[PDB]
Amino acid sequence: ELSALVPVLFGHAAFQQLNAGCQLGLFELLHERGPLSAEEVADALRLPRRSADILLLGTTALGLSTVTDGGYRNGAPIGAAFRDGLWPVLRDIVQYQDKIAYQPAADYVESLRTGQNAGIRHFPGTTRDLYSRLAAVPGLEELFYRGMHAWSQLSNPVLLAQPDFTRVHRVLDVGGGDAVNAVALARAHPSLRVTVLDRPGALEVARKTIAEAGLEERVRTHAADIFTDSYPAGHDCVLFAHQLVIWSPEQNLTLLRKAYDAVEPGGRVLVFNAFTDDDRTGPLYAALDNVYFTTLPFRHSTIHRWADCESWLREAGFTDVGRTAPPGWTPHGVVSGSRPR
Amino acid sequence: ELSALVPVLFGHAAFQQLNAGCQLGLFELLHERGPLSAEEVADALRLPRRSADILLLGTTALGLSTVTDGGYRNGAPIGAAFRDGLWPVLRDIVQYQDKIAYQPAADYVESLRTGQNAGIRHFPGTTRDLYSRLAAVPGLEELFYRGMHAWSQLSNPVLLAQPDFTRVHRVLDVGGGDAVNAVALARAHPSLRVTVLDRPGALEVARKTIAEAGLEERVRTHAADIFTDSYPAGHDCVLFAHQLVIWSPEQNLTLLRKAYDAVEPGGRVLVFNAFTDDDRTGPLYAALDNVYFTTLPFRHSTIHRWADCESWLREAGFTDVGRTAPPGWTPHGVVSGSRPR
Ligand SMILES: Nc1ncnc2c1ncn2[C@@H]1O[C@H](CSCC[C@H](N)C(=O)O)[C@@H](O)[C@H]1O
Ligand SMILES: Nc1ncnc2c1ncn2[C@@H]1O[C@H](CSCC[C@H](N)C(=O)O)[C@@H](O)[C@H]1O
Ligand SMILES: Nc1c(O)cccc1C(=O)C[C@H](N)C(=O)O
Ligand SMILES: Nc1c(O)cccc1C(=O)C[C@H](N)C(=O)O
């Protein structure tokens, strides 16, 4: 049936309805004051009535809102976000899609065909990875880590629940960005110390996250290039969070070997990110989020299969290699291994 | 559950997967040569292996392709397009989404706030409707109508099947574009005459449509402004195809009154386009296609409701006013009426 083409042929428009729903304050409004009529929505949102009608038609047909005798409410996929304390997280992730992902996504066909991250051209600069370009635009690094922070809040419950974190003591957070996961881990397991290793630009943001959490004594930053610099010794566990998806298999094996060398004997390596199913059928989230990785971060970036990741861990010399499957609707999991005593 | 958000939060990426499948020739390849392995796909499409895997993961998770034992075929929605002779139509429509709609869709929020078609900025020029800007880029106007021609082919079965065309003799096709519907009508009704009224630039494209159909005698072009020029007299039937969606309700009443005066007593008026359901719940297609209309053609464009259109015909003096429902997966119909004899 051809009808299945509708959410795909108009997929960009479907995203724009959610985008508009968020930016214009519709979902917050319906949460607090629903049911509301179309006129009431137009008055509260200070929109022309035609505009309100267009938005409401879009969100209602998508199931993001419901209408009942002319009265509008949040649909359950939106209500769920508010229920689970995730509305600011979803809001910030949609802003990321809008400000970072959407326009470079137009360069997807070219990026596939040329094997480049072509969409990076929408960001001023000359280097070939997104992260080293963030400093070129005032406020851009902060905007980026706001989104990345929210992405991690969404995805890291599987990380925080990892059994290793009730055994390990000292965690090296490689490319740990703004310390979102370091702080979450520190709060979840109070005996952990964590070192957040990243570029100076990112650690500038990480310091604010750590200070706000009041965790200066348990979470520290460390400026280093993940490829060209030595990792700090004395760590019990090496964490790659939302990191190996950026690089080639060849590059990841290099990083996992550095991890092996740096982790103490008996220690753990943990790879936390989205994963592609080994049968290459999905999940849908990963298959679609690949458009971002194909177009922006780096010319090799992609959401790798579980099995390929486990393969790299063994080749790096880790033993007892395995995986923890997603507990929910996102495709995030953990691949883990041990350095032999 | 938040899981329902995946095709919307990543909706732009879903479109890009369809977009890439089309442009890179995947769906034609799988149609002719399926099943193929990922390697055979990469070789045939001249993609790096990583790129082929990313693409194939995307199309398969979406159901645009299927995989069995590593062998890839077109999935149901794509197969159905080839089956029904619609593959060239879908290809050209996806190219229109890519080249015309996608980037202006990002101006949706601004368009909603200001009640302007703010996405028109992606096109060189200064005038306030998309169509008068088309001539400013070499090949753009012909590119537009290639897309529009395909939209019309996809949607006009309900038009062609209209009983009226067995009872009328001379159709004035108001804003008839590249004559796609005039020609389809004339082929289906061998004694029907049609006048395609549009801008000079559109009629230059319509000339080729008409020529390649050999319908010079029965299908003619008439350069005129639909608002400011007189409609030529002597026509039995006034047709608005994909036209009233561009304009405000007030402008449409103006147009329908002109249609009334110009049509012979006893004559018919037909309005053919996408329609929004009277209860404002959808259809999804219309609710999403509205992002295009909001961002690009004109500051008032929108997919109007059946009942509002019917209302206009009656106020313009037409009687025996009624509608013809969509006989399938798209939201296209005909609202029609008569001038009293
Ligand atoms: N060459 C390099 N040296 C150090 N850090 C790098 C790097 N290339 C990329 N990174 C870091 O890799 C991170 C990718 S985003 C993931 C950040 C964090 N782990 C989280 O889950 O939220 C960015 O913070 C980026 O600065
Ligand atoms: N002021 C105007 N005068 C004449 N034609 C106009 C116009 N404003 C818009 N149009 C025409 O309205 C048409 C909208 S696109 C629809 C074209 C055709 N009826 C089809 O169904 O395929 C374009 O061809 C555009 O040139
Ligand atoms: N934006 C990212 C990045 O630059 C690197 C790694 C991950 C990300 C992410 O946004 C998270 C990703 N969408 C996920 O949900 O797995
Ligand atoms: N592109 C259009 C236009 O400029 C004017 C009127 C209609 C159109 C369309 O593209 C057709 C619309 N997508 C439909 O399927 O009904």
Automatic annotation (TrEMBL), chains A, B:
Residues covered by the O-methyltransferase dimerisation domain: 9-74
Question: Where along this sequence does the record place binding of S-adenosyl-L-homocysteine?
Answer: Y145, S152, N181, D198, R199, D225, I226, H242, Q243
GO BP terms, alphabetized: methylation
- What keywords appear on the UniProt entry? Methyltransferase, S-adenosyl-L-methionine, Transferase
Q: What range(s) does the O-methyltransferase C-terminal domain occupy?
A: 125-318
UniProt cross-references to Pfam families, sorted A to Z:
Dimerisation, Methyltransf_2
- GO terms for molecular function, please? methyltransferase activity; O-methyltransferase activity; protein dimerization activity; S-adenosyl-L-methionine binding
What is the protein's given name? SibL
